[PDB]
């Protein structure tokens, strides 16, 4: 199906829900829905934002990173090339 303007506006808003929204007040189901939406929509900005803004539980343990999906969907994009900066030397 084609991309509707409402879908494009929501896709432009999806990374912002990670970058500029407090994740400590966010329910876990909404975080899971956001991660599912990013992965199944192939939003590399949203996947990078979810990796860089992890979700803390009530325990204090971070959730696993989306990153295995991002590196397999966009293996050579700038989003993963910036995450591979620890091997630059």
């Amino acid at each position: 199906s084609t991309a509707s303007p409402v879908s494009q506006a929501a896709s432009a808003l999806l990374p912002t829900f990670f970058t500029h929204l407090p994740q400590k007040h966010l329910p876990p189901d909404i975080r899971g829905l956001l991660d599912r939406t990013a992965i199944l929509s192939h939003n590399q900005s949203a996947m990078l934002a979810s990796c860089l803004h992890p979700y803390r539980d009530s325990r204090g343990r971070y959730y696993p990173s989306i990153l295995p999906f991002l590196v397999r969907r966009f293996p050579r994009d700038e989003s993963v090339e910036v995450l591979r900066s620890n091997l630059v030397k």
Partner: peptide
Amino acid sequence: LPTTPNPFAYLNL
């Protein structure tokens, strides 16, 4: 690597 048993369960992809 994630040390949590059964990771990505909340995704249910």
